[model samples]
Target: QTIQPGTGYNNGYFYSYWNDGHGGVTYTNGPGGQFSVNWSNSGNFVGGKGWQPGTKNKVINFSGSYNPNGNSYLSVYGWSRNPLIEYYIVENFGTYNPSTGATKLGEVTSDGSVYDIYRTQRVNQPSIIGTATFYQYWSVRRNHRSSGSVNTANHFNAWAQQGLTLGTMDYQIVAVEGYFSSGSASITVS
Candidate 1:
């Protein structure tokens, strides 16, 4: 399953996922669809809060702080069934761009900014339904910034225009992901 029971913290419509290694990752879920995380020297830790079937006009409002000297990403992350896909609408990053090395298929716009669309394949990796090979869709912002209202539907439509149609919704969350890196973040999503 995508979320192993008793592994992460969850609130009304939110959940957190931390994996790969045992590192210092402090996470807490607050009231009113909010959460925070302070992770240092971890493998891959993500704090997310959203819904089960996440395909909708989720106008995500967020405000926060982030710094990952190694690698980090602030994104709208989710998974889909049928085609079995993992997607990211990356708003900001720390040190590395997740779109690095991936081919840019198109560009999307939201909140007065430009986002480049990309697609990649995970041959065999951990996924929502378990270990499997899947595709990862990305919409990375041109510049990095925090705090905004992400019009998710804009991105969704852009992906479709690029011929990257999504499948059945699994779950979606505005996530702060730390990847083989070290840093921290505190944010509120609603």
Candidate 2:
């Protein structure tokens, strides 16, 4: 396997890495949508816009397209962070519930204090693992300038803020891993 950045909603905060569904189907992209992904919640994610170190992680030089209807998922092989012995999961980014707040969550947030942590709950399909930290970023794009070989997988690697760990990574883990009804917009990592 070629080690590359994430795709779909992948950004600097999370990694996406595009895969051709093993042997199932090929991928597709949107018309003019920007295959973009951003981190959300307070203190959970620290990337995207003007977010500096104190606030959150930052993403730069974004490019690519995303397919909102493609059936792409994550098959976590193994990691040093997983304390749950043999723990692995698959993330489905296409159909997740949008933020219910006035403004879109993860748009751009400042560094929440130690106590000001925002807790994002989990769903059923994705099956809550460990503590559930790290949310996926999904979007769509078109006419991406193919710099070198374009990889749709690991889309959000450039945008991902934190590395996923096994023991209750955070709060948004389930959100990024679970199933979705509507076609995902761009980024989705678990």
Candidate 3:
């Protein structure tokens, strides 16, 4: 996938993909498949964007190769409408920027690795469903891994235990993100 700044979000040339503003993905070829993205800082989102009711047992398993610039990250994202919340498990962080109010919620292992859980509040940000203000729970891996699996059930339990409420699930996705990056990142999942 490729994006050009100031042109708005590019959903890419695929049938079932969605992006927030800049980053995008193109399906490659698997119960699974692969894709690649040529990203920039214009915006950051790429994956299967759709609506699906949330369930405690919901699960999505994937593994991929992410070759990106130092400022990129690969993640699995989820959204909720009624409660207006967005959450994700960031599997790998090539480069990270620390946030002031982010709170560490401990570590949990699911899918294939251990993630350091964190909670942060996002306000006044543009989203596919329009502007939103919500809490973002990030289950970030202890180390960067190009490939891994994600168990949504574990993710839910982790946040639910922390008193962080989530509403009805609207969507779940897997994608790579680039923040102010200027190189290509390739990802393959299966």
Model 1 poorest 10 in a row by lDDT: 1-10
User: Over the full model, what C-alpha lDDT does candidate 1 score relative to the true structure?
Assistant: 0.78
lDDT of each: 0.78, 0.24, 0.59
- The model with the greater lDDT, 2 or 3, is 3
By summed lDDT, the worst window of 10 consecutive residues in model 2 runs over: 45-54
* Best of the two (1, 2) by lDDT: 1
Which candidate model has the greater TM-score, 1 or 2? Answer: 1
RMSD in Å for all candidates: 3.1, 13.7, 5.0
Residue pairs in clash, model 1: none
lDDT of 1 by residue, 112-185 (tens): 88999999999778887889999899989986777778888898888888899888887888888887777777
The superposed Cα distance between candidate 1 and the true structure at residue 131, in angstroms, equals 1.2
List, residue by residue over 8-75, the lDDT tens digit for candidate 2: 23233233323222222212222332223321111111111111111112122323323333222222
Best by TM-score: 1
Q: Write the per-residue lDDT of candidate 3 for residues 63-178, one digit (tens) a residue.
A: 54566665666777667777787787787666564232587887787765777778888788865478777778787776667665667788788888877677887656566666
